Amino acid sequence: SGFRKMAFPSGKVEGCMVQVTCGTTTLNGLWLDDVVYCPRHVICTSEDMLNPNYEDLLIRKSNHNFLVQAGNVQLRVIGHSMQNCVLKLKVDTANPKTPKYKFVRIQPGQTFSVLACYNGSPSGVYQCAMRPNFTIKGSFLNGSCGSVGFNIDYDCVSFCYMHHMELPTGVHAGTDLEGNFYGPFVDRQTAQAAGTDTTITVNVLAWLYAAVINGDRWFLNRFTTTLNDFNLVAMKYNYEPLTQDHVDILGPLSAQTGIAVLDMCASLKELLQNGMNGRTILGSALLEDEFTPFDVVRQCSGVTF
Amino acid sequence: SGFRKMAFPSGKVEGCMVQVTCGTTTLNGLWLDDVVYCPRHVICTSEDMLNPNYEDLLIRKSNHNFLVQAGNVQLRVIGHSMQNCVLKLKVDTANPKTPKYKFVRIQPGQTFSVLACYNGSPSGVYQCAMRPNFTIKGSFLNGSCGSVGFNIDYDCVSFCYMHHMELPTGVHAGTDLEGNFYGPFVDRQTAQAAGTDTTITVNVLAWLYAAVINGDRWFLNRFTTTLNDFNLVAMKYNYEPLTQDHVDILGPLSAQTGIAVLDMCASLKELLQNGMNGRTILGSALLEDEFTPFDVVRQC
Ligand SMILES: CS(=O)(=O)c1ccc2cncc(NC(=O)[C@@H]3CCOc4ccc(Cl)cc43)c2c1
Numbered sequence: 096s097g098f099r100k101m102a103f104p105s106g107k108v109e110g111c112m113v114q115v116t117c118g119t120t121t122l123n124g125l126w127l128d129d130v131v132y133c134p135r136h137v138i139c140t141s142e143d144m145l146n147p148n149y150e151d152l153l154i155r156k157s158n159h160n161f162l163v164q165a166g167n168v169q170l171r172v173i174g175h176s177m178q179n180c181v182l183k184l185k186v187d188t189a190n191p192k193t194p195k196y197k198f199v200r201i202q203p204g205q206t207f208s209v210l211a212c213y214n215g216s217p218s219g220v221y222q223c224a225m226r227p228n229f230t231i232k233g234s235f236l237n238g239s240c241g242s243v244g245f246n247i248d249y250d251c252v253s254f255c256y257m258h259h260m261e262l263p264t265g266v267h268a269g270t271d272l273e274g275n276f277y278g279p280f281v282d283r284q285t286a287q288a289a290g291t292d293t294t295i296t297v298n299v300l301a302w303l304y305a306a307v308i309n310g311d312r313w314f315l316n317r318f319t320t321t322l323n324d325f326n327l328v329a330m331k332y333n334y335e336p337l338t339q340d341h342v343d344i345l346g347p348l349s350a351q352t353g354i355a356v357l358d359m360c361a362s363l364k365e366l367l368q369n370g371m372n373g374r375t376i377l378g379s380a381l382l383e384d385e386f387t388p389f390d391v392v393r394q395c396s397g398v399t400f
Numbered sequence: 401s402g403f404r405k406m407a408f409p410s411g412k413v414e415g416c417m418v419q420v421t422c423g424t425t426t427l428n429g430l431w432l433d434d435v436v437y438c439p440r441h442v443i444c445t446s447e448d449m450l451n452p453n454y455e456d457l458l459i460r461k462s463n464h465n466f467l468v469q470a471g472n473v474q475l476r477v478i479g480h481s482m483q484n485c486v487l488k489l490k491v492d493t494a495n496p497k498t499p500k501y502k503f504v505r506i507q508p509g510q511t512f513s514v515l516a517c518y519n520g521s522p523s524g525v526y527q528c529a530m531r532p533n534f535t536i537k538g539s540f541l542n543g544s545c546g547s548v549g550f551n552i553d554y555d556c557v558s559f560c561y562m563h564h565m566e567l568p569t570g571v572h573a574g575t576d577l578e579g580n581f582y583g584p585f586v587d588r589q590t591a592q593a594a595g596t597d598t599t600i601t602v603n604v605l606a607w608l609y610a611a612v613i614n615g616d617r618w619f620l621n622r623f624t625t626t627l628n629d630f631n632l633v634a635m636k637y638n639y640e641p642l643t644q645d646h647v648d649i650l651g652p653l654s655a656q657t658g659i660a661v662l663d664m665c666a667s668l669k670e671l672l673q674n675g676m677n678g679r680t681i682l683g684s685a686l687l688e689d690e691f692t693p694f695d696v697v698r699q700c
């Protein structure tokens with residue numbers, strides 16, 4: 096029993112974290128095989144961040160300008176190239192701790208674990224979701240750039256995020272491992288704001304199923320709804336539309352609990368229109384949307400890595 | 401900016417997780433140097449649930465009865481001894497991935513990371529607090545016994561918890577790494593119940609300081625309170641008494657935010673009386689008590 100926000104074990108990723116120093120900037124790098132991946136803004140000064148020409152700044156750099164440190168061992172940079180907003184530093188040594196990995200770009204609503212690092216050293220692991228406005232509500236201080244987001248599927252690490260910046264509201268913006276930003280963000284010091292966020296509906300439903308599996312049933316009702324009528328209510332309350340794909344994905348949880356997805360949607364509709372009335376669900380007075388249906392099945396069944 | 405429930409990176413502990421099988425029972429072991437630590441109840445049969453005599457059950461065991469598996473490699477048990485509720489299996493190989501470590505017994509209110517494991521394999525990491533009633537609100541299924549709780553403040557792993565059992569309310573009880581249970585619990589299936597839980601007051605205050613550091617101030621007020629008046633109010637909402645030790649511990653956060661502890665206590669009294677009125681604090685509609693003052697300073 097119990098339901099916690101749970102991250103993947105971070106060991107496979109900890110063995111890849113390195114410190115990248117370029118001039119006065121120090122941030123984190125991801126060392127996989129003989130390449131160190133890090134945010135391209137490591138080559139910027141304070142003025143170079145205001146209006147940057149990264150091709151021009153990079154051409155002026157030499158391999159010895161990049162100081163890569165893996166623990167207390169300095170790695171030798173033998174090449175450098177840029178792929179979108181990520182800098183790739185070719186090193187003379189393949190990381191012996193390189194796990195089986197893939198670079199995957201995730202969709203909003205998908206969750207992943209973040210290994211927050213400072214000076215190439217892991218300091219914390221937490222779970223979060225890619226918000227529908229493409230920001231993440233992370234926990235990052237100065238020096239955390241280059242920290243990565245990942246999932247594990249069997250023994251393969253899927254790297255899905257690299258930290259680049261903090262927006263004025265305190266939320267975070269970053270890229271996939273190919274350097275493509277999630278959201279309409281740019282890696283420069285300019286006016287940028289996160290769009291109005293919405294609730295990840297399929298994830299709330301998954302968390303309501305996790306609550307039922309854990310013995311919390313007060314919110315269940317005799318009613319059902321059409322998918323279209325539910326989406327009218329969801330639009331009203333700044334909730335993401337629920338698709339037939341989401342209904343299908345929730346199938347196993349629906350079969351296990353005996354509560355059809357549209358039956359759980361009618362419970363969610365009542366919670367949205369009436370609130371919790373002083374009650375909690377899984378120790379929360381708000382509807383939680385950072386657990387996907389796969390996370391709920393993984394935690395309530397005990398899948399290992 | 402931002403404030404998340406954050407666990408320590410689990411890599412140093414993952415390299416210590418092994419599977420321990422004894423008869424029909426399989427659970428997790430912690431492999432440090434040449435010793436595998438695990439709950440002694442791994443030696444219990446179906447008839448030794450209510451009143452096991454662990455000394456008697458253990459004397460009947462031989463080293464080859466314990467099957468220890470580290471990955472796809474079977475370790476050879478060359479000795480076995482019991483220390484309180486923990487079984488120590490001497491193995492013929494020192495774990496090459498043994499980190500720098502310590503065994504520390506924690507106090508209620510203290511937080512730690514849990515590396516939940518099944519069959520010696522890590523499946524997830526989450527952050528817990530030792531509740532004032534000495535239980536933990538974990539997420540554990542059957543097979544999670546032997547999963548450990550730890551802190552990794554700089555380089556060294558401090559092991560503070562080993563999972564042993566789930567109480568009827570779905571909360572969890574376990575021991576420190578010396579086999580001493582936290583709470584009045586025993587490793588028997590005899591009727592046991594967690595006492596009435598209370599809120600870790602010093603941790604709620606620490607989290608209110610974290611919210612102020614992060615820009616939230618709506619809950620602040622112009623009032624202060626005596627420590628005694630705060631305790632008289634707080635105990636009516638099942639909050640733990642706030643001691644002078646707790647007031648002192650909150651000193652640095654008080655200095656950093658400019659809000660005296662007793663001033664923040666008056667905000668907490670007001671929140672308890674009024675609720676949040678549709679507002680949130682750090683993305684939460686409830687007062688969070690699983691962040692210590694040390695966690696808040698660490699994360700901010
Ligand atoms: C308040 S601070 O010390 O600037 C700070 C605090 C927490 C922080 C948490 N994650 C990242 C930070 N860095 C940034 O966002 C850099 C600082 C300058 O502004 C930009 C603008 C664009 C880009 Cl691509 C990067 C940055 C953080 C920076």
Ligand SMILES: CS(=O)(=O)c1ccc2cncc(NC(=O)[C@@H]3CCOc4ccc(Cl)cc43)c2c1
Nearest residue numbers: 096441540541542544564565566586587588589
């Ligand atoms: C209901 S279950 O499948 O037995 C179960 C479910 C979740 C569980 C989550 N953590 C631990 C479990 N194990 C226990 O509590 C064992 C079996 C039951 O009785 C005792 C009594 C004393 C001790 Cl020291 C251990 C146990 C769990 C056991």
